[PDB]
């Protein structure tokens, strides 16, 4: 429901 971008 709450996306997360990539850490790089």
């Amino acid at each position, epitope marked *: 429901p709450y*996306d*997360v*971008p*990539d850490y*790089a």
Partner: antibody
Amino acid sequence: EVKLVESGGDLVKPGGSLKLSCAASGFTFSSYGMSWVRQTPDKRLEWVATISRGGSYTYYPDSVKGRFTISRDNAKNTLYLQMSSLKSEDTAMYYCARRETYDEKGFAYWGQGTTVTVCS
Amino acid sequence: DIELTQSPSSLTVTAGEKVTMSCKSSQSLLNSGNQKNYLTWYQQKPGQPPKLLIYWASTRESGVPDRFTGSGSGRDFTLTISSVQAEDLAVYYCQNDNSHPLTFGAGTKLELKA
């Protein structure tokens, strides 16, 4: 047990297209981003695409931007790679891999690989 | 774009020998937030996917014996096998895992002496 299975490789002519698949099991698929990484015949490793766990973020190197699209069906536990405008240079073993959204440690889980050959 | 240089390209080794591998990065791999090196080492046997060996430059992964040591920081990294064994014969790759685009070194190949 975490398992990943690529499929969809084929031999194709330049300028063709192709869609790869990756079946995922053994973990909560919608909790992890995913990546595609290929190994060209000179055995170099080349990162090709990454997608966030929810699908709204995508990343590509300049070499496949505008040609490759990464996508995911979280209800089906499947990751995809659409490849357009294929060049001979795109010949490689393509690997499906889990993005370690929580460990941030690199690539721990890879599939067995599916071979794409674009003819020269 | 971050370039990783692995040296030497290939190494002929006898059993029990110590092995030293070099991975040099054109930019620092020191993460802004946690100040760990986002440098990952892989070991690849033929017909197999690369297998994760060391992460954060120096943390061994499960199942990896203490024969292996990753070391170095920022831009100059080293993989050391104190005493090479047959099951260690493989190609070793380092990976920038810190900033896009993700990039890999060309690999250092271990081969047994004829």
